[PDB]
From a paper:
ONO-0740556 provides an extensive interaction network with N-term, ECL1, 2, and TMs 2, 3, 5, 6, and 7 of the receptor. The binding site consists of a polar recognition region on the extracellular side and a hydrophobic pocket within the transmembrane region. The head phosphate and glycerol moieties of ONO-0740556 are located in the polar recognition site. Two oxygen atoms of the head phosphate form salt bridges with K39N-term and R1243.28 (superscripts indicate Ballesteros–Weinstein numbers). The phosphate group also forms a hydrogen bond with Y34N-term, and is tightly recognized by the positively charged resides K2947.36. Moreover, the nitrogen atom in the amide bond forms a hydrogen bond with E2937.35. By contrast, the long acyl chain fits into the transmembrane pocket in a bent conformation and forms extensive hydrophobic interactions with the receptor. Notably, the aromatic moiety in the middle of the acyl chain is sandwiched between two leucines, L2786.55 and L2977.39. Furthermore, in the acyl chain, the C14 carbon forms a CH–π interaction with W2105.43.
Numbering used by the authors: 23 to 81, 83 to 150, 160 to 230, 256 to 323
Write the structure that this text describes.
Amino acid sequence: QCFYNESIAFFYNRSGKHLATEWNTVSKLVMGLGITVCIFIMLANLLVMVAIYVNRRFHPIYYLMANLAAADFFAGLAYFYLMFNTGPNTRRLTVSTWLLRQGLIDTSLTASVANLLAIAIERHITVSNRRVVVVIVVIWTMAIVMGAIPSVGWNCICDIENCSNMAPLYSDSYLVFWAIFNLVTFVVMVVLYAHIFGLLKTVVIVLGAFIICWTPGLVLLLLDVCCPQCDVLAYEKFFLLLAEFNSAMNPIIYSYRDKEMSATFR
Ligand SMILES: CCCCCCc1ccccc1CCCCC(=O)N[C@H](CO)COP(=O)(O)O
């Protein structure tokens, strides 16, 4: 029993979500903060890629740093397009277009997370251009397939009853998958960096950015998929902004230590 016939209104009304036909103080506030964060991400990551390409000094570690910067740039673009599509604007959507929006978000953040794990793995190995391009194509292939799987097959077009409260169309199975994927990625980063340490400031801030910008989102998604009657829609719009603020901080987290890169920035 599968229904692509209904519009977004049917799916929201099925769920607990609110369409927000009219503009709001909260809607204007989140639009302003989101556009600010997106402008910051785009500018900062454009600067990082320009530097990593202008200097022959940063010609594999800096390739993975620039790949992380490009994924964060894509996250900025995805979040920028998600804005100018919220509040009353969401009411103008269709199933295909809304899936476009959420798929861009999925692939962008998955690419950012995979680049963080790849930089951790390279740092572990360090402690030609073959392994670096192999891991870049693995990161991008995994990001695209992860952002496309719900857009094709893995969503609640067919089970209205069994899917999420926040994403009315993604399923509890997909949200559990994404969140456990991110959780195991974070524990792999923690074990790699702890083994490396066994420097403390760099490790703590690198893990801390990730924990304070993801644990909110991941615990929120697990609550949505596990606990009924846990009012979890309330703190969604700001937790996504925190997840994008992670990609905002990544360019200065992974470029502050390099005095050469600091001198480069011009
Ligand atoms: C697609 C799932 C990927 C995995 C989770 C991503 C994530 C992380 C941290 C906070 C939130 C999320 C997504 C939550 C839904 C996406 C959205 O845009 N929600 C907002 C919540 O107010 C409504 O968007 P809209 O209804 O205004 O279009």
